[PDB]
RNA sequence: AGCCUACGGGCAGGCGCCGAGGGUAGGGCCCGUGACUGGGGCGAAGUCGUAACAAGGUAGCUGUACCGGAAGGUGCGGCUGGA
RNA sequence: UGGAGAGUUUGAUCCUGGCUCAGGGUGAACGCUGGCGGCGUGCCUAAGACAUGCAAGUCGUGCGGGCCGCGGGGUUUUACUCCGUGGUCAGCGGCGGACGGGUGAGUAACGCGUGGGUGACCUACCCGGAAGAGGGGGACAACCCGGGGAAACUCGGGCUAAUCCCCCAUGUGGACCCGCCCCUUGGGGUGUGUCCAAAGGGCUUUGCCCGCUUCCGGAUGGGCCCGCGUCCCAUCAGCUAGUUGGUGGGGUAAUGGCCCACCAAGGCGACGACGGGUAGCCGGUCUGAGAGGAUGGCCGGCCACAGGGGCACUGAGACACGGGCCCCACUCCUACGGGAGGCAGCAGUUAGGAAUCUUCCGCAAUGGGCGCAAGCCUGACGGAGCGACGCCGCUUGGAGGAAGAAGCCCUUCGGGGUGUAAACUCCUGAACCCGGGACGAAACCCCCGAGGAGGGGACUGACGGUACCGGGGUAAUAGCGCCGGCCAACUCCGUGCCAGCAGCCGCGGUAAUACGGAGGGCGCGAGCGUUACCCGGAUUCACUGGGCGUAAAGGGCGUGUAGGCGGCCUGGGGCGUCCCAUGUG
C-alpha cells in the first residue's frame, strides 16, 4: 500500500530525511508521490523538523500508512491532537 | 482530448471504410520556412456514407481494426477530387523513378 | 602546500616591490634597492620585448604572488569572481581581501601575509569567539576576527599588536588594539586597496 | 539450495489440478447443453445450463476462473442457448433465461 | 483399457493443430583469403628520349579516332586559357 | 554579461585553401614522483567461465504431528498417556518470493520522451461507506507398515486436523439472457427468470479485538490506444498472404487480424516504403558567445534481459535471475539404470585487457517482508577497507640574516649568477604521547487515560574511544614538464645529416639557446607529463554565419511533372502567427 516514509538524503554521516508518501515497492530513495515535510535527525539547525499537516491529514485519510517512525515525527508535529 | 482532424478522403474501395489524408504545418526546426507534411489514416466508415473527394473530420477512437483508430466524426465538404488528383498524381510519378 | 622558498626573488621578477616580508622589505631593500632587476644568471641584460602573453601573465601572477595563494584556488575564485553581478575586475579583488588569512595581514596581527597564515593555522585565531586554521575562511562583514585566548599572551601577537597601535588602519577595518580584537567592517572597494596591479589586465589573460 | 520454494511449487501442482478440474466440467457441461438446445429438449437443455451458471459462478468464487471472465461465459453460453432453442421451442422450461 | 466418483463428472492416457530446434536443397548480402594480374603512391643513384612553360623552337588545349618504345603524332571539329 | 587567435604554399604581395597548435572536458590508462585528511568514485573489454561464504522469508493468535525440555497429573490406585507450557524439525494452510539488488545482450519499436484517450480495462495488502456468516460433508501430507534405489528421490497399503477442498440455506448486493427508460461506442436506472457468498482464532469470555464474505467508492500501481519528437546507407526503389478491410466466432482484465472460418481486393512508398548497418531511451552530462555539435558511466524514471532457445503452471500481479517443463552448450556425481548445477546479487576466483576494489562491520539508523506483539530475515542499506581515479581543505615552517659563506655555473678575469638562499638567532608546533569523548536514538514496548487524543516511564550505537574538546609536544616529503617561432623562460660543454629531436613550421653536415649533460630560467605542484576520446578554435557543411567569370563549384540546351514561391482592392473564416489565463513541464 502506500506509505509515508524517510527517504535518506544529504552526505555520509549528515543524514537528512525526506518525509514523503510513495508506494512501499519505491526503493527508497526513489520516485515518491509528493514530499510532505522533512526532518533533521540532529537538529543541527532551528527548524530541525517540518510538516504540511493540511495534506498530511489527507494521506492518512485516503489509506495512507506512515512508518512507525513517520509516526513519531507526525504525532510530534501534532498531527493526530484534534481537540 | 480525443484528438480530431481534417483531411480528404483518398480511398473507399475497403469495406466500411476509407483512407483519408490530413496535411500539418509547422517551422523547420534550424531553418525556420513553414513546411508542410501528411499521412494518411484509415477511418471507420460503418456506412460508407463518405465517399471519394469528401474532406472530412476524425476523430481517436477505439480500436477498430490493425490500421483502423479513426471513425469518421463529419463531413465538412463534398467533392473535390483537385485534392485527390494531387495525391494520386503524386502517386502515379513514383513509377517514373525505378528501374 | 603553499610557496615555500626565495620570496624576495620574485620581487626582483616582477620588477615591483612585494611587500611580503616585515622589516626588511622596508630596510634598504625587498630584496630590491640593491639588485632591481630580475634573478638569474641574466637579468642584468638588455630586456626583451614583451608580448601581449608577457603582460596579462605577469600583471596575473604579480596579484597571485602577493596573496601568496595556489594555482587552484586563484583560478577558482576568478571564475567564482565572474558568477557574481558587479565588476568582475573589483569583485575579484574583494574575494581576496576576504580571505582570512588576509584579514589578519591587513589587521597587523602579523609582520607578512605568510606569518599570517602561520598564525592562523596554529589556531592562534578567532572569529566570533571561534578558533579557525583555514587561512581559506571567507571572511563575512561584522566579524571579530580576534586573537585566540590562550594565544593573546605572546612574544610575536604582543609585538605585533604593541607596534600596531596609533597606525590607523583599513577603511573597511576595525583594529581594536584593547582586546586584540577586530572587525571586518564591509567588503572593501575598488579605491580603499591598493596594489601594483591593473585587474583589467587579470580579466584578459583568463580569457585565453 | 533446499529453499523451500517448492513449498509453492508443490502447492501449485495441487492447484493447477483443482483448476483443470474445475474448468473442464465447465467447458464439457456448456457443450452438452448447447448440444441439447440446437437438438431440441428444452426440458433439460435448461436444467443443464442452470447447472452451468452455477459451476461458472463456482469456481469464479475461486482463483481460478474469475473477473468478467465469469460474465463472458455465462453470456455467450446462455447466449447460444437462446437463439438454439428459439430455432423453433419457445422457452419450455422456465428456469435459466427470462422470457 | 487404468484411477476417482456423491454416477452428473474428473484425472491419467491417446490423437490432432501449432511448435523450439535439427536435416536436406536452392538462392541473397557481407567478410577473409588466392597462383597470377592491373594500375596508384613513396624511395640514394638509375636507363631512353624532350611532350609541356618563351613561335618551347610544328601555338597550346580539348572531344573523338587511328597509330607509335615512351612522352607523344596525326585526322576531324571546337576553345583562346594563344598572335 | 557574452565572442582574441597563431604557424605553414611566395623572391615578395593579396586572396583562396587545407593541415597543425594554444582551451575545456574524462568511469580513464601509461611514465616519473608521491605527505595528511573530508566528500565522492572505481571491469568502458568476454551478456566469457566460476571454488567458497552470504544474499527471502516469516506466522504456534490458521491446523495436526515428530523429537527434547520444565510444571502437573489422571481413574478408589497403577501401565501410561492425558493436560499446560517453552523450544525444535518438517508437513498442511496463509502472506511475501513479480519488490528490492545486477546487467545493456536484444530492441530503430508506441521502446523511449512528451501531451492525451480508455463508453474497451485490471488493481493484493491500505482507507471510507452498505450488508452478512445457519447447517451438513470430504480429501491429502506430516505419522505408521512394507517394498525399489548408489544417490536424487520414489511406488504401494493404512489413519488424521484446520482460516484447505465441497454440498445445502439466507442474497445486502453482484453476474448473465431479454424488455423498457435515460445517456450515448460496452455509461446509468429498472422489471421478470436464472446464478454466486463466508473461517475461524485470541483475550481481561458474554465484551473487546485480529481475521473472513458480497457490493459500491477512494488511494496506489498497471494493461491497452493515439498525436507529435527520436541514428547512418538511395552504390537498398520498389514492398506486402494475415498481406488491407469486412461479417461471424476464438482468446483476454480489456480493444485489435492477436488467432480462426467465410467474403471483399486491398494496405505502404522519394514527406524515403522495403533492405542493410548501428544502438537501450530519457531527466541530464561535456563543449560553445550563442545557434549548434557530442553524449547517456555515477544518481532518478522507463524498458529489456538473467548461459542460448522455446513453453506454459501458480497467482491480484510473472512467462518469473536465486520457481516448473523441454531442446542446445558447459560444469559435476554415479554402482552407468540414473542424477545435480547456473554471480549481469555481495565479496572473491579465472580468462580477456592499457585498465577497475575488501571473500570486512552492523541491522544501531532508514526502507522492505512476515507477525497481535515479542521478534525474525534483510551483502537493500548504514559504515569501514583498497586505488592521487575526481573534487576540496592542508603540511614540508615563520621573522631576523652578508655589498653576499662554501660548492657549482658563467667571465670582457675586473666580476657576474644561484642568493636571504644556506648556516646561525629567535618564534610557532604537522607528527607523536596523555585525559576526557559524542550527535546520529525516539518509536516500537510498559502503566495513567479507553487499546483513541494527551501524559508519563524505560530499552537499543556497527561506525568508535572514531569525530571533537582539553594538556604535553618534535622544524617536519618535492617533485614533473618546458626554455627556436606559436609560447612564459639563455648560457657553457659534448656531439658533427652521426647520435638523436619533433604537435605543425622545421633543428643537427665545427663554431646548435631545437640533439645530450650542466648552470640558470619559466610554468604548474602531491602532482606533473604522455597517449586516447569528445566539443572548441573550425566562420572549414556557414539557420545564426560560406560560396560557384578566372581559386573547388551553373546542369550542353530546351519542354514540362510533383514541389517551392507569387501583383492591387473589399469582405467571411481564424489553420499558420500573436497575447492572456490555466494544466503539465
Ligand atoms: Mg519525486
Ligand atoms: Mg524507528
Ligand atoms: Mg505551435
Ligand atoms: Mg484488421
Ligand atoms: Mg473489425
Ligand atoms: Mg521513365
Ligand atoms: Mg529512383
Ligand atoms: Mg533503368
Ligand atoms: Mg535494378
Ligand atoms: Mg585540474
Ligand atoms: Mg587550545
Ligand atoms: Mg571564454
Ligand atoms: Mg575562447
Ligand atoms: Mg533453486
Ligand atoms: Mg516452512
Ligand atoms: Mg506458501
Ligand atoms: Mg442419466
Ligand atoms: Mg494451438
Ligand atoms: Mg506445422
Ligand atoms: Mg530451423
Ligand atoms: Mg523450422
Ligand atoms: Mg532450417
Ligand atoms: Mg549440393
Ligand atoms: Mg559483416
Ligand atoms: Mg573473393
Ligand atoms: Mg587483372
Ligand atoms: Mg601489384
Ligand atoms: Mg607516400
Ligand atoms: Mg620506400
Ligand atoms: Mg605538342
Ligand atoms: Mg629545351
Ligand atoms: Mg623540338
Ligand atoms: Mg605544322
Ligand atoms: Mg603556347
Ligand atoms: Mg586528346
Ligand atoms: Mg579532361
Ligand atoms: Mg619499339
Ligand atoms: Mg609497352
Ligand atoms: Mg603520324
Ligand atoms: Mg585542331
Ligand atoms: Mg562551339
Ligand atoms: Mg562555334
Ligand atoms: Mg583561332
Ligand atoms: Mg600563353
Ligand atoms: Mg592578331
Ligand atoms: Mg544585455
Ligand atoms: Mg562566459
Ligand atoms: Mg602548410
Ligand atoms: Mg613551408
Ligand atoms: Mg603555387
Ligand atoms: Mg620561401
Ligand atoms: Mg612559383
Ligand atoms: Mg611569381
Ligand atoms: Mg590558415
Ligand atoms: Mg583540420
Ligand atoms: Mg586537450
Ligand atoms: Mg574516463
Ligand atoms: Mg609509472
Ligand atoms: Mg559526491
Ligand atoms: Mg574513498
Ligand atoms: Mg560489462
Ligand atoms: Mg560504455
Ligand atoms: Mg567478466
Ligand atoms: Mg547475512
Ligand atoms: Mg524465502
Ligand atoms: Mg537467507
Ligand atoms: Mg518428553
Ligand atoms: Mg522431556
Ligand atoms: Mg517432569
Ligand atoms: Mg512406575
Ligand atoms: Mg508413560
Ligand atoms: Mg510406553
Ligand atoms: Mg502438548
Ligand atoms: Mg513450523
Ligand atoms: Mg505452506
Ligand atoms: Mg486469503
Ligand atoms: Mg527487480
Ligand atoms: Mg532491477
Ligand atoms: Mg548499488
Ligand atoms: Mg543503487
Ligand atoms: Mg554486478
Ligand atoms: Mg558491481
Ligand atoms: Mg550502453
Ligand atoms: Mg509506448
Ligand atoms: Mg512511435
Ligand atoms: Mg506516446
Ligand atoms: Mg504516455
Ligand atoms: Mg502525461
Ligand atoms: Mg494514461
Ligand atoms: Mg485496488
Ligand atoms: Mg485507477
Ligand atoms: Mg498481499
Ligand atoms: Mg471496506
Ligand atoms: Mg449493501
Ligand atoms: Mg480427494
Ligand atoms: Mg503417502
Ligand atoms: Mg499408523
Ligand atoms: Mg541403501
Ligand atoms: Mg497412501
Ligand atoms: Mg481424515
Ligand atoms: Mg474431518
Ligand atoms: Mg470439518
Ligand atoms: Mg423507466
Ligand atoms: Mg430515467
Ligand atoms: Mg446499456
Ligand atoms: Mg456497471
Ligand atoms: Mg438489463
Ligand atoms: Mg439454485
Ligand atoms: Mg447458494
Ligand atoms: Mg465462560
Ligand atoms: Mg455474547
Ligand atoms: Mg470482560
Ligand atoms: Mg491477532
Ligand atoms: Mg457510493
Ligand atoms: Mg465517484
Ligand atoms: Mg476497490
Ligand atoms: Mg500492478
Ligand atoms: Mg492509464
Ligand atoms: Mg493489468
Ligand atoms: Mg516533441
Ligand atoms: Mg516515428
Ligand atoms: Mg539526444
Ligand atoms: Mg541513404
Ligand atoms: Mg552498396
Ligand atoms: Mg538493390
Ligand atoms: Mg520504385
Ligand atoms: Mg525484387
Ligand atoms: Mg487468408
Ligand atoms: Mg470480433
Ligand atoms: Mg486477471
Ligand atoms: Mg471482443
Ligand atoms: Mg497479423
Ligand atoms: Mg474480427
Ligand atoms: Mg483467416
Ligand atoms: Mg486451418
Ligand atoms: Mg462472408
Ligand atoms: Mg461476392
Ligand atoms: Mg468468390
Ligand atoms: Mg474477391
Ligand atoms: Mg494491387
Ligand atoms: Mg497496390
Ligand atoms: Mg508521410
Ligand atoms: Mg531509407
Ligand atoms: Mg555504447
Ligand atoms: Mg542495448
Ligand atoms: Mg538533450
Ligand atoms: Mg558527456
Ligand atoms: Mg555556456
Ligand atoms: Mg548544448
Ligand atoms: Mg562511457
Ligand atoms: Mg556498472
Ligand atoms: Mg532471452
Ligand atoms: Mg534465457
Ligand atoms: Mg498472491
Ligand atoms: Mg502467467
Ligand atoms: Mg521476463
Ligand atoms: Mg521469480
Ligand atoms: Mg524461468
Ligand atoms: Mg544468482
Ligand atoms: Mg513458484
Ligand atoms: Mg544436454
Ligand atoms: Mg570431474
Ligand atoms: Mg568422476
Ligand atoms: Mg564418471
Ligand atoms: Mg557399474
Ligand atoms: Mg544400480
Ligand atoms: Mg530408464
Ligand atoms: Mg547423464
Ligand atoms: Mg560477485
Ligand atoms: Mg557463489
Ligand atoms: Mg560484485
Ligand atoms: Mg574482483
Ligand atoms: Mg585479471
Ligand atoms: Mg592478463
Ligand atoms: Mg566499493
Ligand atoms: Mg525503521
Ligand atoms: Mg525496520
Ligand atoms: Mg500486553
Ligand atoms: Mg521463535
Ligand atoms: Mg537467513
Ligand atoms: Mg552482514
Ligand atoms: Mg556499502
Ligand atoms: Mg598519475
Ligand atoms: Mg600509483
Ligand atoms: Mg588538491
Ligand atoms: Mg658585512
Ligand atoms: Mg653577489
Ligand atoms: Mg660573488
Ligand atoms: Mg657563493
Ligand atoms: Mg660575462
Ligand atoms: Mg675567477
Ligand atoms: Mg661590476
Ligand atoms: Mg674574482
Ligand atoms: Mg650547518
Ligand atoms: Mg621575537
Ligand atoms: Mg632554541
Ligand atoms: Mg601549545
Ligand atoms: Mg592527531
Ligand atoms: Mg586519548
Ligand atoms: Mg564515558
Ligand atoms: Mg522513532
Ligand atoms: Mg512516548
Ligand atoms: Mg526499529
Ligand atoms: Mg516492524
Ligand atoms: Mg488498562
Ligand atoms: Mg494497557
Ligand atoms: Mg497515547
Ligand atoms: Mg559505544
Ligand atoms: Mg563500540
Ligand atoms: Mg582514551
Ligand atoms: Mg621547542
Ligand atoms: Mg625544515
Ligand atoms: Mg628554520
Ligand atoms: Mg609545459
Ligand atoms: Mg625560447
Ligand atoms: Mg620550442
Ligand atoms: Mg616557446
Ligand atoms: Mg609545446
Ligand atoms: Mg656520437
Ligand atoms: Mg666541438
Ligand atoms: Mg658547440
Ligand atoms: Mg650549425
Ligand atoms: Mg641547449
Ligand atoms: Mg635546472
Ligand atoms: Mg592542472
Ligand atoms: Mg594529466
Ligand atoms: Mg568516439
Ligand atoms: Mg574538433
Ligand atoms: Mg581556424
Ligand atoms: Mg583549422
Ligand atoms: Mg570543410
Ligand atoms: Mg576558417
Ligand atoms: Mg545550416
Ligand atoms: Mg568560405
Ligand atoms: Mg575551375
Ligand atoms: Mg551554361
Ligand atoms: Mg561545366
Ligand atoms: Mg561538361
Ligand atoms: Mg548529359
Ligand atoms: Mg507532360
Ligand atoms: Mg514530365
Ligand atoms: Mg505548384
Ligand atoms: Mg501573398
Ligand atoms: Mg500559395
Ligand atoms: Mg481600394
Ligand atoms: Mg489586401
Ligand atoms: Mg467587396
Ligand atoms: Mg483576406
Ligand atoms: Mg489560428
Ligand atoms: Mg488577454
Ligand atoms: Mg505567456
Ligand atoms: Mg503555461
Ligand atoms: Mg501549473
Ligand atoms: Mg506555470
Ligand atoms: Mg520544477
Ligand atoms: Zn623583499
Not at chain 1, 537538529?43 to 493540511?54: C, G, I, S
Not at chain 1, 491529514?57 to 498531527?79: E, M, N
Not at chain 3, 586573537?147 to 604593541?162: C, D, G, P, T, W
Request: proline share 4%; glycine share 6%; hydrophobic share 35%.
Amino acid at each position: 500500500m502506500v506509505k509515508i516514509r524517510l527517504a535518506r538524503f544529504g552526505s555520509k554521516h549528515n543524514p537528512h530525511y525526506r518525509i514523503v508518501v510513495t508506494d512501499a515497492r519505491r526503493k527508497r530513495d526513489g520516485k515518491y508521490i509528493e514530499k510532505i515535510g522533512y526532518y533533521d535527525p540532529r537538529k543541527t539547525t532551528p527548524d530541525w523538523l517540518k510538516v504540511d499537516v493540511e495534506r498530511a491529514r489527507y494521506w492518512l485519510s485516503v489509506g495512507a500508512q506512515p512508518t512507525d517512525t513517520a509516526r513519531r515525527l507526525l504525532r510530534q508535529a501534532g498531527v493526530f491532537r484534534q481537540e | 482530448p480525443k484528438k480530431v482532424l481534417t483531411g480528404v478522403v483518398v480511398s473507399d474501395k475497403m469495406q466500411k471504410t476509407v483512407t483519408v489524408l490530413v496535411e500539418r504545418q509547422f517551422p523547420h526546426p534550424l531553418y525556420g520556412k513553414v513546411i508542410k507534411r501528411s499521412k494518411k489514416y484509415l477511418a471507420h466508415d460503418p456506412e460508407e456514407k463518405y465517399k471519394l473527394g469528401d474532406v472530412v473530420e476524425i476523430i481517436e477512437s477505439r480500436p477498430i481494426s490493425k490500421r483502423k483508430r479513426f471513425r469518421v466524426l463529419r463531413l465538412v465538404e463534398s467533392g473535390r477530387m483537385d485534392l485527390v488528383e494531387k495525391y494520386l498524381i503524386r502517386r502515379q510519378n513514383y513509377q517514373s523513378l525505378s528501374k | 602546500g603553499r610557496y615555500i622558498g626565495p620570496v624576495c626573488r620574485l620581487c626582483r621578477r616582477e620588477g615591483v616591490k612585494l611587500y611580503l616580508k616585515g622589516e626588511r622589505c622596508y630596510s634598504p631593500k625587498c630584496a630590491m634597492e640593491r639588485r632591481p632587476y630580475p634573478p638569474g644568471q641574466h637579468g642584468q641584460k638588455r630586456a626583451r620585448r614583451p608580448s601581449d602573453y608577457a603582460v596579462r601573465l605577469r600583471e596575473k601572477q604579480k596579484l597571485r604572488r602577493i596573496y601568496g595563494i595556489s594555482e587552484r584556488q586563484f583560478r577558482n575564485l576568478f571564475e567564482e569572481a565572474s558568477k557574481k553581478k558587479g565588476v568582475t575586475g573589483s569583485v575579484f579583488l574583494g574575494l581576496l581581501e576576504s580571505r582570512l588569512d588576509n584579514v589578519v595581514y591587513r589587521l597587523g596581527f602579523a609582520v607578512s601575509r605568510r606569518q599570517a597564515r602561520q598564525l592562523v593555522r596554529h589556531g592562534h585565531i578567532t572569529v566570533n569567539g571561534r578558533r579557525v586554521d583555514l587561512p581559506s575562511y571567507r571572511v563575512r562583514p561584522g566579524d571579530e576576527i580576534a586573537v585566540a585566548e590562550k594565544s593573546r599572551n605572546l612574544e610575536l601577537i604582543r609585538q605585533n599588536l604593541e607596534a600596531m597601535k596609533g597606525r590607523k588602519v583599513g577603511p573597511w577595518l576595525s583594529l581594536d588594539v584593547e582586546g586584540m580584537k577586530g572587525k571586518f567592517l564591509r567588503l572593501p572597494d575598488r579605491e580603499d586597496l591598493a596594489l601594483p596591479v591593473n585587474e583589467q589586465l587579470v580579466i584578459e589573460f583568463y580569457s585565453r | 539450495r533446499n529453499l523451500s520454494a517448492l513449498k509453492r511449487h508443490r502447492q501449485s501442482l495441487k492447484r493447477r489440478l483443482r483448476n483443470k478440474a474445475k474448468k473442464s466440467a465447465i467447458k464439457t457441461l456448456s457443450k452438452k447443453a448447447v448440444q441439447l438446445a440446437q437438438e431440441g429438449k428444452a426440458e433439460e437443455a435448461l436444467k443443464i445450463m442452470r447447472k452451468a451458471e452455477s459451476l461458472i459462478d463456482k469456481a469464479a468464487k475461486g482463483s481460478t476462473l474469475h473477473k468478467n471472465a465469469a460474465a463472458r461465459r455465462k453470456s455467450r453460453l446462455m447466449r447460444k442457448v437462446r437463439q438454439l432453442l428459439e430455432a423453433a421451442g419457445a422457452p419450455l422450461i422456465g428456469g435459466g433465461l427470462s422470457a
